[PDB]
């Protein structure tokens, strides 16, 4: 509907797959080469389904900060025959607040879904499902069970992936450029 939705759509159309684990279907953001991200609560194993194709996981790393606190991001390398468009230059370098973000989801349950979530706060610490978690972004939209792993964007930046909510607010784990240096 506007330039925010334009940038979000450009990311969804080229840099997302539908990931299925034993814990459900997730929006999964491809970042570069065969490297993607997913919420750590997806519990990625040795095999994952990518757009309903059985795919070997070559590596999976649940990220933690240097205080050894959960970040809720898992970086996955997929045994896929095709690379993602490299979008690392759209990743922020530092922790920040944002105006006018869009949360975008693509699953069997929620195809082609885009939500204008508005102002995004650098919230920081959250007890997420009982797990102390750092680098959380917060937005005032009643997000539902199923939007997790969804890409949070502003115009020109991919800033996070949806990892939870409390019925009134939604919470995203930051993406930082430094996570994807090769
Ligand atoms: N995520 C939501 O809060 C939300 C609101 C209205 C809806 N109607 C169809 C799906 C849906 C999701
Ligand atoms: N609170 C929520 O809306 C919530 C909780 C757990 C979830 N797992 C993946 C999506 C998601 C959303």
CB-based contacts of 55, cutoff 8 Å, min separation 6:
47, 48, 49, 78, 79, 80
The C-alpha angle 65, 147, 13, rounded to 5 degrees, equals 95
- Ligand with the closest atom to the CA of 166: 2
**Direct distance between the N- and C-terminal alpha carbons of the chain, in angstroms, rounded to an integer:** 36
Q: How far is CA 50 from CA 54, 107, 114, in A?
A: 7, 11, 21
Pairing between β-strand 113-128 and β-strand 131-139 as defined by DSSP bridges: antiparallel
Output the residue whose Cα is nearest ligand 2's atom 9.
148
At how many Å resolution was this determined?
1.4
Catalytic residue, chosen from 25, 106, 134, 148, is 148
Counting ligand 1 atoms within 8 A of each CB, the residue from 117, 144, 166, 169 with the most, and so the one to mutate, is 144
Is residue 148 annotated as a catalytic residue, yes or no?
yes
Task: Name residues whose C-beta falls within 8 Å of residue 125's C-beta, 6 or more positions apart in sequence.
Answer: 132, 133, 134, 136
Say which ligand is closest to the CA of 163: 2
Which tokens in the block code for residue 122? 């650098």
> Which residue in the list 72, 106, 134, 162 is annotated as catalytic?
72
Atom of ligand 1 nearest to the CA of 144: 1
Sequence ranges of the domains in the chain: 1-15+85-182, 16-84
Q: What method was applied to determine this entry?
A: X-ray
Q: What is the 3-state secondary structure (H, E, C) of the chain?
A: CCHHHHHHHHHHHHHEEEEEECCEEEEEEEEEECEEEEEHHHCCCCEEEECCEEEEEEEEEEEECCCCCEEEEEEEEECCCCCECCCHHHCCCCCCCEEEEEEEECCCCCCCEEEEEEEEEEEEEEEECCEEEEEEEEECCCCCCCCCCCEEEECCEEEEEEEEECCCCEEEEECCHHHHCC
């Amino acid at each position: 509907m506007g330039p925010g939705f334009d940038f979000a759509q450009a990311i969804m159309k080229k840099n997302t797959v539908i990931a299925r684990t034993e814990k459900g279907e997730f929006t999964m953001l491809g970042v570069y080469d065969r490297v993607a991200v997913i919420p750590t609560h997806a519990s990625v194993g040795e095999i994952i389904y990518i757009n309903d194709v059985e795919t070997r996981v070559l590596d999976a790393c649940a990220l933690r900060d240097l205080t050894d606190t959960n970040l809720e991001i898992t970086i996955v390398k997929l045994d896929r025959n095709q690379k993602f468009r490299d979008i690392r230059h759209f990743l922020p370098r530092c922790e920040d607040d944002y105006n006018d973000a869009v949360l975008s989801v693509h699953t069997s349950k929620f195809p082609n879904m885009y939500i204008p979530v508005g102002q995004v706060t650098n919230y920081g610490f959250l007890n997420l499902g009982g797990t102390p978690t750092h680098r959380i972004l917060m937005y005032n939209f009643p997000t539902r069970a199923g939007q997790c792993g969804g890409v949070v964007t502003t115009t020109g930046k991919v800033i996070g992936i949806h990892v939870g909510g409390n019925g009134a607010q939604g919470f995203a784990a930051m993406l930082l450029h430094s996570y994807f240096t090769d």
